[PDB]
Symmetry: D3
């Protein structure tokens, strides 16, 4: 093997998502930070073992990749593709670097973020900063259990990590982020039965709706895709609520990892553009994307060796 980053992390209940762009002349400061980021993860986290579960995953955008490195590029790396649907729009916003920081406690996330941004002061410009918190029974902002169908164990390794198909970058992965804001008033206006039809599962028991009854414009319907293999195509998600009550913001921060962006991008097309039999994913009638960025999260050794 090479060591991948902590893409397959345990259940964690807090996160910080940090997206930044690299200023003019920043490339050197950044390259230094990248070579140390693994050891900052350990500095902050080691002393909080073992309940801490602190991990930071670092990702790099398509344009940033070319400023920072020469040598070949990961096969799949490109700017996030805007999707201008008949009704709904998946936007593209700027981002050169992603830090996806996760732990059991927000303060650990904050301490690591402090250390990282400390080393980058001068060189970067923050584009997004989100402090996320999982609800107490793995629920998201819509009140549904979120994560149930994520792959685990060897299936997750298979779905998420670059392998032999791009051997130079094996152990890497492709992360897509989108920040969503929900219209909770609208959403709470539906009966539970109606909400279950939007999602495709039971609210309370989290059991899948039977095929004979699950709508084709339900979220679970549109994000189940079968490959040429006959194999189901899987991504790894770690959606996190965030918000502010004073400013009436209630959000879900989407992040999905896959071994090639083609998978993540297909699901997005289905959601925003629709299919043969579905105008668009009903979940977008209550959720607006306000960011969109795609990153490559290299193998851990790649970063070590600079």
């Amino acid at each position: 093997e090479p060591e991948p980053q902590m893409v397959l992390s345990p259940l964690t209940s807090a996160a910080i998502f940090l997206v930044v762009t690299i200023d003019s002349g920043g490339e050197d400061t950044v390259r230094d930070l990248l070579s140390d980021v693994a050891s900052l993860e350990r500095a902050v986290g080691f002393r909080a073992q073992p309940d801490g579960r602190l991990s930071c995953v670092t990702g790099i955008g398509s344009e940033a990749w070319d400023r920072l490195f020469s040598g070949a590029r990961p096969a799949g790396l490109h700017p996030f593709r805007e999707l201008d649907g008949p009704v709904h729009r998946a936007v593209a916003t700027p981002g050169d670097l992603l830090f996806h920081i996760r732990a059991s406690r927000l303060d650990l996330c904050f301490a690591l973020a402090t250390e990282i941004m400390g080393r980058l002061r001068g060189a970067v410009t923050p584009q997004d900063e989100v402090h996320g918190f999982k609800y107490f029974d793995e629920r998201d902002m819509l009140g549904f259990v979120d994560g149930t169908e994520n792959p685990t164990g060897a299936a997750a390794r298979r779905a998420v990590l670059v392998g032999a198909e791009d051997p130079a970058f094996a152990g890497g992965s492709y992360a897509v982020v989108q920040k969503y804001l929900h219209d909770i008033d609208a959403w709470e206006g539906l009966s539970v039965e109606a909400q279950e039809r939007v999602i495709g599962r039971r609210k309370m028991t989290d059991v899948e709706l039977s095929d004979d009854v699950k709508p084709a414009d339900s979220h679970v319907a549109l994000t189940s895709v079968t490959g040429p293999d006959g194999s189901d195509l899987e991504i790894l998600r770690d959606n996190m609520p965030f918000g502010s009550v004073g400013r009436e913001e209630f959000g879900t921060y989407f992040i999905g990892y896959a071994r090639t962006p083609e998978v993540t991008e297909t699901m997005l097309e289905r959601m925003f553009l629709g299919t043969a039999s579905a105008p668009h994913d009903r979940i977008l009638d209550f959720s607006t994307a306000v960011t969109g960025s795609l990153f490559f999260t290299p193998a851990a050794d790649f970063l070590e060796d600079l």
Copy 2:
């Protein structure tokens, strides 16, 4: 008689501080919410037992008190007094209601805050909202253990709850809030030994500096008051770090409860204005107050009506 609000809460690691002003004509919506706030605390919290440790303490400002109620006022209740020191200034900022929401997990805090602000949409205007997190070994944003000398058990009851001296409002308390922002670059410029001289305790072990060596302008020096009888005057604090890395904000949200504001106010005068033998509290050379508000947190039964 009285059940007080959850002023003496267990150690909790997350908080939301929500400060609002009441719009014109809002008084009725507010009065309804106050009668229900206890049962929202239970709705949201009960099912997360026993890890949850969700509590909300509700406080009311001096001007708001007059809008909402007639009858007596709590004897100590007045607007926060600005302190214009030689060097440092304690500001006074607007606030009619305080919700001091605490739990072991932030999401519980957020769920209760959602429900409360849900019932108040229309009637109020948010002034401040802070999501706080205690660092993993009870440390604050300056890296010091924060809370060590708070009173506990019976001493805390004695220090924090209104009693026979204002018997109409026994079970209540007086909360003072100040939001502080720190100059971290400045602070991290000091050696540990120097920082210990600012605070008055050892950084790593949290042992008090001995009397013979503790500076008189150290924080612990200026916030130790004895009353007339020689007995120490205590408050109960629950300071919480908060911040944002992107915008370089690193903060401590101060809240102190006391059975009369006279105590909290004296410590503040000493800090901002100085004494005989100290220009001001050295901690203010790294910490700037950008809010200041005083609230009365009534006994729980008072709100039930």
Copy 3:
């Protein structure tokens, strides 16, 4: 002076309810056991400190009281009063002794029950034995949060413990038990909104329905009683699910403690017999009582001194 039994126990996640009758000639064996029950609680429980939270509360029925003791009777003690409603019937079934055993683990409950029934074989006849468990996030078999409005701290002391009004028995309490079996098929036939109208609170969030909307034949409506005082009358409940999937039994084991049975019994009248404006508690359309018994749970010192 007087030390009550562990009526105000912490949240515990397992229970055994044991109801027995005293055979002819059994009175002596029983009286010995009552003086020892506290020390068996310690024997079993002490070694599993402090996670264990094992408590046994012992209660005695009205006719059994006369067989066991002469001297004064607790003022409120009588046989459970059958309620023959127009539609629903609260039955009264035999029971001389109650052991309400609670802990964080079932095995501790079982161990204590073993020791107690060990000393009593010969003298008693088991009438009911239920092994109960917490569901999830304090939910009951109907899927609602169960316990939310129980009194706590000082208010609970005030509501549950006999005081100056019967000074001989101060520290005691009155327990009523009813075993309920639910018609789950029927219940799952309702929409959530319909179920919420039966109970009087929201299913998922456990927020009370406003007066503006709460039905008068909702369960929360009928079990809220105000005294002549204008003050609410409260009891302390510790309902436990129990069940068997093979026999389709899904149950709620109801137990309510109060300082006088008049309170518990009023709530029951309202539920079974109805009011001005409500035929009966809608919850009984999905719940059948198959036992009913009333006991006095003396102060702990009362039992010691035998």
Copy 4:
């Protein structure tokens, strides 16, 4: 080739459900089997990572033949009755086994509910046992139960079908027996005597040395070596159960192995005895009232229907 969760962590609660398939039920059963994996997730996922909910599904000999056609697991047959001179191991009906385990009973019960929900109509319950860990992994005879089970790779190799039956690799063979103990009789023995029945020390759980351990002790008769001299091992997860009302005290026995030959050798030695032992002394205080054998297929066999 992924197996079912036969190697579970230590879990403190179990439900064992044994059912028979009614005539005409075969379709409803085959549908459920393809979904049982996704119900495990639906119910269990939200209680992670304490939950440790796992369901292992097994199929009986006759039922196999009603549900599927083509080739059979090499070792799958009806449980073989044992008519010893003193003790008898009976065979009872059972077409399907759900071995449901978690850190809490309610997760077990919730999954059992959803499964039987989908099968109401097609099947008839034969046995339903709610098991609990006692204290410190002790059983109803008061001895530590589990100590010599294989772990890690030794357990993979002892319990999963491999190259010797390639079509069914990933599978295992579960034998179940419900045992009731005569506790009165058992508590009549001194501890030293009880230790001679089991073959280990009661309080410390150290093995008796070979020069003192009886040949009719349980640990003696269930230690079996192969012709190659290596130990033949199974994986057990015995659960106490009972009812104090009915003076029923039980150990529900479940033993997984890569071939039933191993499990069946141990049973023959227990019930029928050896050269130098009439029968396992533990059977003088334990009566078997069920007996069933099931094959627990690889996970992908059930998914793909």
Copy 5:
């Protein structure tokens, strides 16, 4: 009350017992430390709350009391009395100060002990230091559950704290310590039934032997003493195993608190000297006392103010 020291501590699983004598001239250093010991307890412990449960109880001997303070003496304070029995001897060994430090983790105990001995370097001479650990189910070194019959709640307050009978020192208590070493080879030579006869309870289940079968020279027999009222006299114990495998030392560190030493001393006479009906406590045939000291543990305010 005035505020007592933490005599009534929860179950904790580690302890350090530190016994020292005061050197000539040391009186001043000691008086300073006593006024600060409360705040050292908080310094060390606060940051590990609430898992920590660090408590230190400070006690002062008879002769030391006279060197340190003028004013009245606690009524019960005197040197531990050697008991020279026909067979077994309870020795008396020197000690001016006792620190009984307890927590859930040894390191917290050690940190506080380091701080205390740090301030006393110069002034004192260590006599005894034991690091104790609870065996995993509250068992002691002989394999029996140890602590079961200790009083709790109000009964414990009543049994251990000085009240109106010596009003000047209300909130105080009297601690006796004895370090015992066991003859494990001998002990393991007995059957369990024989050991149960030594102690007076069942080994595994921790149930008391019935009166009609419990020997009069069993430990539980000789340490059960009834006052004039017929009511039991109780102490509060927190025995801790300690040992060293290399040197074959297996020990029990005995500590008992009582509101008057007369109770603790009665139990000791019965154990060591015997009664009309018991030669001596059979436990002493497997246990040798190698220390013996008596201390007064004042109310916490007493230490605060000087």
Copy 6:
């Protein structure tokens, strides 16, 4: 194939290190115990699942190897080599057997140590016995976080276990032990800044000093070693504080596992003998080694077959 001993343990907060020598004639008794030591680990530890985390690692010295075993020797096994530096000295002390016993509680360690020494009483002579405890945030006796840079997962498998380079003993490891006693007075005389320069990392935050500020005589500097390969050479440490406040002993018990002793021995030469640009490791100016032994810890299978 082969199963190693529990070299890679979880984080554990208690340990007993027991070093013994085999007396003449003891070799049979010792061979017996080695074949059972695996099953005593389970006897003691099984019932304390899953919190217990009891593990025993057994190591054998060079000379003992020769007395105990039939055929060939681990390639790297020799006597610990004394290091006679110009200022500091790494001594070599007797030790044939090592038991490295770890768990989440000291009592489990003690119970296993008891059972082991039980079987060996007669055949061996104790040289060293240390009861270690982790400070509450992975700190050592100098107040620095200790453990931070240890390897994890596959990196640790690679750096610690013998493989195909000595195939008869693959699954084994090489342990070096050294008991160090610190001069706390001296050490606490330094400012924190000075202490950080001795170690090479920050005291409070545990972040590494940047390369242009990190002294070459700092501990972290001298124990960072690259191989001829350009790769960093790693060991796995589990240093445990220990001590006695009475006797002013404050200690760090050093144990380092590696797949060859060459690595551990290189770091020691650098520490005690110095480099191009450093006299010796500054940490030795506050730490004195009083033991030194090297052992080989065979695969689990090796011991079972005896």
